[PDB]
Amino acid sequence: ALTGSYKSMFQKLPDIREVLTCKIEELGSELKEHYKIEAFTPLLAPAQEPVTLLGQIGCDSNGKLNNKSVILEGDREHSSGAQIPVDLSELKEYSLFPGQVVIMEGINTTGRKLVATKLYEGVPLPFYQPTEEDADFEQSMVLVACGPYTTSDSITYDPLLDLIAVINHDRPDVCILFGPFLDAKHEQVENCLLTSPFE
Amino acid sequence: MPQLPQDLKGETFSHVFGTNTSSLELFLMNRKIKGPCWLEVKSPQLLNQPVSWCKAEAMALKPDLVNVIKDVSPPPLVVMAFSMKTMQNAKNHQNEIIAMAALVHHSFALDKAAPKPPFQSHFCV
User: Fold this and answer.
1) Residue in B closest to A113 by C-alpha
2) Family, per the entry (chain B)?
C-alpha cells in the first residue's frame, strides 16, 4: 500500500478515463460470472425484449442525485461510454449512489431510456483465509481513535493527553490513531495565528 | 463429421489450416463465383419436398456441378419499400404495429436507370 510520498501530482485525463472504465469492467466481468448472465446489451442499442445493461450510475446535473434524474453510463468495451437516463417507476427495491457500479435489467425499446426491472445485488469479496498459524495467536485488544485531538477553541490537545493516559491505564496491544493531528480546519490553524511552523 | 480444433498440433505437423472455414466461402471460391451472375447447374435433382417459399427448387449433389455462365442478360429485380408505423403500449413496454404500407415494382433494372415512377403496384394495411 504505497510507502513513499508519491509518483506525482499531475493527471492525464486519458488515464482517469482508462481507470473508471476498468472499474466498471472488472466488477462487471465478475458480477457476470456470479449471476451467470450471458451478455450485456449496449446502452444505446434498442430492443423490445428485456436487456441486461452494465454501467455506472451518475447524476445528470450538478445537484443531489434523485429517483428521477438517475442515469447509467455504460462501459467503454460494450457501450463505448454512452449515457442513457434510467426509469425506476417500475422498480421495487433499490439502493443507488453516484458511481455505483451496477448491473440492471429492464426494457429499452427506443434506446433512449431504460425502464429498470431488476437491480442486481452487489457482490463483495471472499473474506481472508486463515492459515493454521493465525489460529495459534492469543487474544489482543486494539484501541482505535481519530482526531481532531483538541477542542475547537484551544490548542491544548487535552483530549490527546487523556487518550494517552487511557492508553497507559488499559495497556492496549495496538493503538491505531486517525488524523487530523493538526486540523487544517482548526480555527487558529486556518488563520495562521500559530507562532510555530506546522511541520 | 466432427470439426478439428483450431490449435491442433502433433507428431508430424506443426500446424493445420482449414478447420473452421465455412462451406459458403469454400463454395464461392472453388467455383469462382464473383457475386450475382448466371450459374449452370448440371444433373439437377428433385427434392422429395420443398424447402423454400420460392416458386422453383432444385438441388445439386456435388458443388463442382455448379459453374458460371457470364454470357446472358441480367434479369431485373423484384422490389419492395415499406414504411411502417408503431405505438408504445399504454399498459407496459411494447411497441405495437398499427400499419404498414409497401410499394412495389416487379421489374427493377439493376443495370439501367431507375424506373419512373419507382413502382407499379402498392398497398397499405
Assistant:
1) B93
2) Belongs to the DNA polymerase type-B family.
